Design a protein around this ligand. Structure first.
Ligand code: NAG
Ligand code: NAG
Length: 223
């Protein structure tokens, strides 16, 4: 996260940390006790990662706070790598997370809901503060603004900071964009230097139904 402030413990309790060999590579959100919503793009270079909930300081063990999980199944709906279309993915946890003061669910918008340009949102994560720089051990967050459609693409929700540098950076992939208390976006990509803008998030409301379907039909799938 660029241009942000350090978060307090349990300030974004729905946040997730996707790690590989203990190395954080993407963020995500708990949207249901058994699933975490993230970015399909996070999965290119698979499920031999872990999902960490309730973390704060990436360097500590915070045993009394964290819950760790394996990924039983991955669900994508038309992800297109080439264009980065439909960059959204659902991970099913090996087991049901427990809901504590440090681990909660972030609600979803209704199918097709919209957010207008100029709307104020928040984004948090452990990503770096500079292109190719080092991750942040504490989560950080920044106030962002929804841009005009013309600045974005239909599949996404785009944002910017009134200020200078602000936005997502390395490690912020799949982290959620939260507007009016709901997960309106999933961090996808951004062009050029972190902080420049605008930032591209998958438009969550377009997938509500498909998501519900997944939630309602759990289980690895065809074999
Ligand atoms: C959402 O919008 C699409 C395209 O505008 C439409 O075809 C579909 O009927 C809509 N779904 C509902 C739940 O409004
Ligand atoms: C976010 O916005 C609120 C409301 O304007 C503000 O008072 C607060 O300082 C901001 N925090 C940062 C991290 O932008």
């Amino acid at each position: 996260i660029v241009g942000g402030r350090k978060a307090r413990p349990r300030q974004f309790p729905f946040l997730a940390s996707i790690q590989n060999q203990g190395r954080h590579f993407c963020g995500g959100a708990l949207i249901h006790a058994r699933f975490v919503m993230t970015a399909a793009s996070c999965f290119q270079s698979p499920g031999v990662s872990t999902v960490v909930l309730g973390a704060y300081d990436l360097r500590r063990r915070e045993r009394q706070s964290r819950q760790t999980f394996s990924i039983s199944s991955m669900s994508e709906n038309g992800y297109d790598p080439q264009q980065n279309l439909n960059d959204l993915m659902l991970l099913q946890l090996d087991r049901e997370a427990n809901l504590t003061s440090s681990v909660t669910i972030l609600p979803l918008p209704l199918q097709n809901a919209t957010v207008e340009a100029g709307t104020r949102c928040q984004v948090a994560g452990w990503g770096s503060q500079r292109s190719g720089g080092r991750l942040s051990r504490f989560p950080r967050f920044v106030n962002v603004t929804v841009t005009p459609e013309d600045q974005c693409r239909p599949n996404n929700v785009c944002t910017g900071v009134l200020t200078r540098r602000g936005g997502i950076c390395n490690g912020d992939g799949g982290t959620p964009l939260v507007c009016e208390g709901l997960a309106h976006g999933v961090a996808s990509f951004s062009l050029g230097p972190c902080g420049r803008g605008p930032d591209f998030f998958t438009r969550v409301a377009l997938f509500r139904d498909w998501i519900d379907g997944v939630l309602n039909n759990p289980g690895p799938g065809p074999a």
